[PDB]
Amino acid sequence: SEAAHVLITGAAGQIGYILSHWIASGELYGDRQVYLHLLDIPPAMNRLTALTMELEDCAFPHLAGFVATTDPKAAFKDIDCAFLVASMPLKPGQVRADLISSNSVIFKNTGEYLSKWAKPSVKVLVIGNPDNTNCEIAMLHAKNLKPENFSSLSMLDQNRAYYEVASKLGVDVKDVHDIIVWGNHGESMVADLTQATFTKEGKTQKVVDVLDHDYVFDTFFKKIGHRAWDILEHRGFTSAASPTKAAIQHMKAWLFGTAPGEVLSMGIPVPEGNPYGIKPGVVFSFPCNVDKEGKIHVVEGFKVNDWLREKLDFTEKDLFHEKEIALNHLAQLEHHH
Amino acid sequence: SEAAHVLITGAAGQIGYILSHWIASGELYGDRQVYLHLLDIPPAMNRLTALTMELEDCAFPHLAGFVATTDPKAAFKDIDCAFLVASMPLKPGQVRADLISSNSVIFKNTGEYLSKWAKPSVKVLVIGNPDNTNCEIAMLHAKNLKPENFSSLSMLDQNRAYYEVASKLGVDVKDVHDIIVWGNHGESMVADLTQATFTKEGKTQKVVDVLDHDYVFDTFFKKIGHRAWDILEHRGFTSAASPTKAAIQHMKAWLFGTAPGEVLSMGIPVPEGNPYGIKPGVVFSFPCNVDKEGKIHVVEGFKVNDWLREKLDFTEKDLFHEKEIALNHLAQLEH
Ligand SMILES: NC(=O)C1=CN([C@@H]2O[C@H](COP(=O)(O)OP(=O)(O)OC[C@H]3O[C@@H](n4cnc5c(N)ncnc54)[C@H](O)[C@@H]3O)[C@@H](O)[C@H]2O)C=CC1
Ligand SMILES: NC(=O)C1=CN([C@@H]2O[C@H](COP(=O)(O)OP(=O)(O)OC[C@H]3O[C@@H](n4cnc5c(N)ncnc54)[C@H](O)[C@@H]3O)[C@@H](O)[C@H]2O)C=CC1
């Protein structure tokens, strides 16, 4: 077989460094070889060279080759999947609206590169923040691609939730089931425990039937929400290994399918006629599985109580608002020209 | 199965960060769960805490639990294997004798902790520099353990050599065979291409028969020698992912055995009656394989020409010298 071509943007950063090695080690594509397209900006090219040197010094049997570059054509040409890690960080004094705005241009341009140069079968995982909206913008501006080509990463938050709940309950993570992260990232994200069950001593119960209401519907989202800050506080830098783990997990499931009973939160273009009353037009985190053909499906059968309904409606509203900001910013720049 | 207990020293550093995650992902012990013992020093507590939070945030099914601590006893208690990454760095104005001396204390103490608290079957991989001598010192001070419990990491250098020679030949790494790293780390390391072959267009030839003499016996060793430096110059930090890769490769082979035809350079206490005329009493990188019971063996059948003989003798002499420095320093401290 021919090697799979894999793009990583912002390749010289923390996440790119780990992600490239992990993929080159064979963890993503199994026995198949990989060819890495490694994209960054000119200031970062020395760091990027250092990365390629270490890749080389691993003598990876799965690594068919690589290109390290600042050129979009070289980075996107004939790729099979992409980890869009790079984004424009928040500048001092900026609010979220400005973050959405600055990134809208990057992701418009990236959608255009994808459509022009990537394989029609390309699987694009959006990681750089604001990821749901960056994904929507990239998709909207990729004329030869389709919704099925795009998703955004919410698995980091799901993994955080699983560990938090399992620890609280005093069980292993494998003994907790059906925790879901819905909607947008950021403040409106819905960390849903209302479906969740756990097994302890051969006894299976619902999480919300055992834990205090205060914990579930207050303390829990608080700990999840301040987790990244807490890591930065102690580390001096933001997370790197844990988003990488989640990214590989998402893509591997997307490529080859999920396991029986497995439910992974994934940001996807909202399907028309989804069973949870979400309006098409944005990228929204749903409970998902993936079939052996690599197609993502929203998992049916979960229940929406009044609390969840309100939270879903709020994060839906939030996502359409972000989209509006992004499209308006692009329209204003266009008008100015 | 009960969880395998895995120690990583210097856990809060760059290598420790990646190594802990890679192991927790299941890549070392397969289906068996792991329980990480993460040791570092007092000023690194916050970075260690940060590491544990990220491990937690991966929701690894292979991670049974962890201890993250500055306490020796908690870190070494009932461990099954150890990656000894931490070491005393060279301080400005110090020479190699100083580096050997400062680390001898640390590794004497580590040998004692290992003997006192680790399982008798513990597999100890020494990574922190100077690794051959650190390994020898820890072993000598591990009363209840044996030479079989100890090895040192030379696989990063072998992997570097394979990619260098493959790139020079314009072939795939898989098409190059029998490159070996012998002896000590540092200046006297022997990057041996005299056994090595490669395949291309249906022909197998010796590397030394095809590549230029100046390349093989000068340019090549210089390239391998200034590689770490060149990465530092570009990265702003020392290598991390590549030594982690080699360390997992080494330990996984040690745990389950090597594949057919596979030859891994490994630093081991010199076996009596090894076929390459090396004296017992130091830790020396040999071409090795590992049997299905996890026992390391020196590979037989390689040839020692006059060039290799001289290089082997020089690095051997170098190792016994380093050992002497370390033991003399420890002796001074006693009296
Ligand atoms: N969705 C999720 O679950 C999470 C996402 N993230 C996102 O990942 C991003 C990267 O994180 P780190 O790797 O820690 O950051 P980093 O600052 O270490 O590296 C970012 C890299 O992107 C590069 N870059 C900037 N603009 C670029 C462009 N137009 N094209 C290509 N490369 C470009 C930089 O040169 C740098 O090498 C963050 O900015 C954040 O948005 C971070 C954590 C979790
Ligand atoms: N054998 C090989 O192939 C290679 C070995 N190395 C070795 O790896 C070592 C560390 O590399 P990184 O982790 O990237 O360095 P780093 O500087 O990022 O972190 C080293 C860690 O060791 C800790 N440490 C220092 N003294 C300690 C003690 N007595 N007990 C416990 N922890 C202690 C530090 O607090 C620090 O967290 C180097 O000292 C070097 O000797 C590096 C490259 C290749």
JSON list of N, CA, C and O in Angstrom, two decimals, chain A residues 8 12 39 41 71 166 173 203 211 251 319 321 329-330:
[
{"chain": "A", "resi": 8, "resn": "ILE", "atom": "N", "xyz": [0.13, 18.10, 9.70]},
{"chain": "A", "resi": 8, "resn": "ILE", "atom": "CA", "xyz": [0.05, 18.76, 11.00]},
{"chain": "A", "resi": 8, "resn": "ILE", "atom": "C", "xyz": [0.45, 20.24, 10.82]},
{"chain": "A", "resi": 8, "resn": "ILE", "atom": "O", "xyz": [1.58, 20.53, 10.42]},
{"chain": "A", "resi": 12, "resn": "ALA", "atom": "N", "xyz": [5.68, 22.88, 14.68]},
{"chain": "A", "resi": 12, "resn": "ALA", "atom": "CA", "xyz": [6.85, 23.09, 15.53]},
{"chain": "A", "resi": 12, "resn": "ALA", "atom": "C", "xyz": [6.52, 23.40, 16.99]},
{"chain": "A", "resi": 12, "resn": "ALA", "atom": "O", "xyz": [7.43, 23.56, 17.81]},
{"chain": "A", "resi": 39, "resn": "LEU", "atom": "N", "xyz": [3.71, 21.72, 8.64]},
{"chain": "A", "resi": 39, "resn": "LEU", "atom": "CA", "xyz": [3.57, 23.14, 8.28]},
{"chain": "A", "resi": 39, "resn": "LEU", "atom": "C", "xyz": [3.73, 24.06, 9.49]},
{"chain": "A", "resi": 39, "resn": "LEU", "atom": "O", "xyz": [3.11, 23.85, 10.53]},
{"chain": "A", "resi": 41, "resn": "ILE", "atom": "N", "xyz": [5.28, 28.50, 10.45]},
{"chain": "A", "resi": 41, "resn": "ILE", "atom": "CA", "xyz": [5.63, 29.81, 9.91]},
{"chain": "A", "resi": 41, "resn": "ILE", "atom": "C", "xyz": [7.15, 30.06, 9.99]},
{"chain": "A", "resi": 41, "resn": "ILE", "atom": "O", "xyz": [7.83, 29.43, 10.80]},
{"chain": "A", "resi": 71, "resn": "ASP", "atom": "N", "xyz": [5.14, 26.43, 3.05]},
{"chain": "A", "resi": 71, "resn": "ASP", "atom": "CA", "xyz": [4.37, 26.58, 1.83]},
{"chain": "A", "resi": 71, "resn": "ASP", "atom": "C", "xyz": [3.07, 25.78, 1.88]},
{"chain": "A", "resi": 71, "resn": "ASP", "atom": "O", "xyz": [3.10, 24.57, 2.08]},
{"chain": "A", "resi": 166, "resn": "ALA", "atom": "N", "xyz": [-14.99, 9.31, 37.56]},
{"chain": "A", "resi": 166, "resn": "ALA", "atom": "CA", "xyz": [-14.50, 8.02, 38.06]},
{"chain": "A", "resi": 166, "resn": "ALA", "atom": "C", "xyz": [-13.80, 8.19, 39.41]},
{"chain": "A", "resi": 166, "resn": "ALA", "atom": "O", "xyz": [-14.01, 7.38, 40.32]},
{"chain": "A", "resi": 173, "resn": "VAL", "atom": "N", "xyz": [-11.97, 4.27, 35.13]},
{"chain": "A", "resi": 173, "resn": "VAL", "atom": "CA", "xyz": [-12.66, 4.97, 34.04]},
{"chain": "A", "resi": 173, "resn": "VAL", "atom": "C", "xyz": [-13.44, 4.00, 33.16]},
{"chain": "A", "resi": 173, "resn": "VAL", "atom": "O", "xyz": [-14.47, 4.38, 32.59]},
{"chain": "A", "resi": 203, "resn": "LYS", "atom": "N", "xyz": [-22.76, -3.71, 40.64]},
{"chain": "A", "resi": 203, "resn": "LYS", "atom": "CA", "xyz": [-23.99, -2.94, 40.71]},
{"chain": "A", "resi": 203, "resn": "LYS", "atom": "C", "xyz": [-23.89, -1.72, 39.80]},
{"chain": "A", "resi": 203, "resn": "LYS", "atom": "O", "xyz": [-22.99, -0.90, 39.94]},
{"chain": "A", "resi": 211, "resn": "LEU", "atom": "N", "xyz": [-24.68, 10.95, 43.06]},
{"chain": "A", "resi": 211, "resn": "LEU", "atom": "CA", "xyz": [-23.95, 12.17, 43.41]},
{"chain": "A", "resi": 211, "resn": "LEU", "atom": "C", "xyz": [-24.88, 13.32, 43.79]},
{"chain": "A", "resi": 211, "resn": "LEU", "atom": "O", "xyz": [-26.00, 13.42, 43.28]},
{"chain": "A", "resi": 251, "resn": "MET", "atom": "N", "xyz": [-9.04, 10.95, 15.66]},
{"chain": "A", "resi": 251, "resn": "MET", "atom": "CA", "xyz": [-8.71, 10.59, 14.27]},
{"chain": "A", "resi": 251, "resn": "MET", "atom": "C", "xyz": [-8.70, 9.07, 14.03]},
{"chain": "A", "resi": 251, "resn": "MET", "atom": "O", "xyz": [-9.16, 8.61, 13.00]},
{"chain": "A", "resi": 319, "resn": "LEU", "atom": "N", "xyz": [-23.22, 29.20, 19.37]},
{"chain": "A", "resi": 319, "resn": "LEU", "atom": "CA", "xyz": [-22.51, 28.85, 18.14]},
{"chain": "A", "resi": 319, "resn": "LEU", "atom": "C", "xyz": [-22.95, 29.66, 16.93]},
{"chain": "A", "resi": 319, "resn": "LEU", "atom": "O", "xyz": [-22.12, 30.05, 16.10]},
{"chain": "A", "resi": 321, "resn": "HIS", "atom": "N", "xyz": [-24.08, 32.62, 17.01]},
{"chain": "A", "resi": 321, "resn": "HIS", "atom": "CA", "xyz": [-23.58, 33.96, 17.27]},
{"chain": "A", "resi": 321, "resn": "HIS", "atom": "C", "xyz": [-22.11, 34.09, 16.88]},
{"chain": "A", "resi": 321, "resn": "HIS", "atom": "O", "xyz": [-21.71, 35.08, 16.28]},
{"chain": "A", "resi": 329, "resn": "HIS", "atom": "N", "xyz": [-16.92, 39.67, 10.23]},
{"chain": "A", "resi": 329, "resn": "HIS", "atom": "CA", "xyz": [-15.55, 40.16, 10.19]},
{"chain": "A", "resi": 329, "resn": "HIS", "atom": "C", "xyz": [-14.99, 40.01, 8.79]},
{"chain": "A", "resi": 329, "resn": "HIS", "atom": "O", "xyz": [-14.37, 40.94, 8.26]},
{"chain": "A", "resi": 330, "resn": "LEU", "atom": "N", "xyz": [-15.23, 38.85, 8.18]},
{"chain": "A", "resi": 330, "resn": "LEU", "atom": "CA", "xyz": [-14.74, 38.60, 6.83]},
{"chain": "A", "resi": 330, "resn": "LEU", "atom": "C", "xyz": [-15.40, 39.55, 5.84]},
{"chain": "A", "resi": 330, "resn": "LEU", "atom": "O", "xyz": [-14.75, 40.08, 4.94]}
]
